[PDB]
Design a protein around this nucleic acid. Structure first.
Ligand code: K
Ligand code: K
Ligand code: MG
Ligand code: MG
Ligand code: MG
Ligand code: MG
Ligand code: MG
Ligand code: MG
Ligand code: MG
Ligand code: MG
Length: 224
RNA sequence: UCAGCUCGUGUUGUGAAAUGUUGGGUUAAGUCCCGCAACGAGCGCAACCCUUAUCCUUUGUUGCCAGCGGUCCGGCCGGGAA
C-alpha cells in the first residue's frame, strides 16, 4: 500500500495531544487543532516490513491470530481472518487464552461437543429448559472462542489492532515468545510490539486498509 | 440449614498473600444474568427421596352401598364395582 491510500482512510489522525504516550514521539509528524498527526512517511516503510515478515510466517505454514475486540474493528477482524482461513479473537480476550491454553482448550472441546449436539438433534430431546440452557452456553462459547476453535495450539504470530486496548493479549504473547504485529496509535505504548505500525486504530476506514493488506500477504504467502 | 468454604492452571506481588470469590442488577440461596486477568473445577444451594393437597387406570375383601330385589330395619341377606 502507498502513502495516498493511507491518507484517504485517515491513517494519519492520532489522538488529542493530552492523551499521548511520549514513547510515540519518533512516529509523530506534528499537531493540528490539538490532535497529533502521525508521520505517514514512517507508517509506510514500517508496514511493508510488517507485511514482509507476515509473508514469511505464512509461507512456513504458520498460524496468524487476529486480535481486535474494539467495536470499530470487531466485525472486520472476523471478515479478514476468514477470507484468509486463519484465526481471530474479536470479542473480549479471555485472560490466559495463550498462557493458560491448557485450560482454555477444554472450553474449545465443550464448544465442539455442544455444536455437534446442535447438529445432531439432542436439543429436541432435553427437557426444554435443559436444551435452552445448553443453546445459551453455545452462543457464549461461540462469541468468545468461535475464531480459534480449529487453531489446535499456540499461534506463531499475533496481529493486533490498538496495542493499548489489547495490552493483555500482547503481554501473553511476549510471555510465550510469539511475535506481535500491531497497529499503535499515539496514545499507546509500543514497547511490547515486535513490529510497530503507527497508524489510526479507531477509524473503520483505516482498520480495513490494515486488515486487507495483511489478509493479502498471507493468502499469497500460503500459495507459494 | 447459616450461605458459605476451597482447589488446579494462569496472572500480580521480593514476600506473607491476592485474583478468581470483587463490581452493576437480582435471588430464599457464591441463585442467576451482565461486566471483568482470569479460565475452569470441587464441597455446599437447588434438584433427585418420604409425606400431604387434585385426577386417572387397574384390583374389589375382612373395606364400600348408587341403582336394584327381599328384610326381623341391622349392608342384615341376595346381589352391585358406582
Ligand atoms: K506491595
Ligand atoms: K491461584
Ligand atoms: Mg512470582
Ligand atoms: Mg468467601
Ligand atoms: Mg480472596
Ligand atoms: Mg455484584
Ligand atoms: Mg453455586
Ligand atoms: Mg466474577
Ligand atoms: Mg438440598
Ligand atoms: Mg331398596
Amino acid at each position: 500500500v502507498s502513502m495516498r491510500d493511507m491518507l484517504k482512510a485517515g491513517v494519519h489522525f492520532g489522538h488529542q495531544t493530552r492523551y499521548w504516550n511520549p514513547k510515540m514521539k519518533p512516529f509523530i509528524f506534528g499537531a493540528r487543532n490539538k490532535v497529533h498527526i502521525i508521520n505517514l512517511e514512517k507508517t509506510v516503510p514500517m508496514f511493508n516490513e510488517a507485511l514482509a515478515e507476515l509473508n514469511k510466517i505464512a509461507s512456513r505454514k504458520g498460524k496468524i491470530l487476529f486480535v481486535g475486540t474494539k467495536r470499530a474493528a470487531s466485525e472486520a477482524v472476523k471478515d479478514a481472518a476468514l477470507s484468509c482461513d486463519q484465526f481471530f479473537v474479536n470479542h473480549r480476550w479471555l485472560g490466559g487464552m495463550l498462557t493458560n491454553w491448557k485450560t482454555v482448550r477444554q472450553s474449545i472441546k465443550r464448544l465442539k461437543d455442544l455444536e455437534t449436539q446442535s447438529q445432531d438433534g439432542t436439543f429436541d430431546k432435553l427437557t426444554k429448559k435443559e436444551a435452552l440452557m445448553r443453546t445459551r452456553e453455545l452462543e457464549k462459547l461461540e462469541n468468545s472462542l468461535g475464531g480459534i476453535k480449529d487453531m489446535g495450539g499456540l499461534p506463531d504470530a499475533l496481529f493486533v489492532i490498538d496495542a493499548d486496548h489489547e495490552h493483555i493479549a500482547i503481554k501473553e504473547a511476549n510471555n510465550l515468545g510469539i511475535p506481535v504485529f500491531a497497529i499503535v496509535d499515539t496514545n499507546s505504548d509500543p514497547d511490547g510490539v515486535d513490529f510497530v505500525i503507527p497508524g489510526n486504530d479507531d477509524a473503520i476506514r483505516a482498520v480495513t486498509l490494515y486488515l486487507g493488506a495483511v489478509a493479502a500477504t498471507v493468502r499469497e504467502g500460503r500459495s507459494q
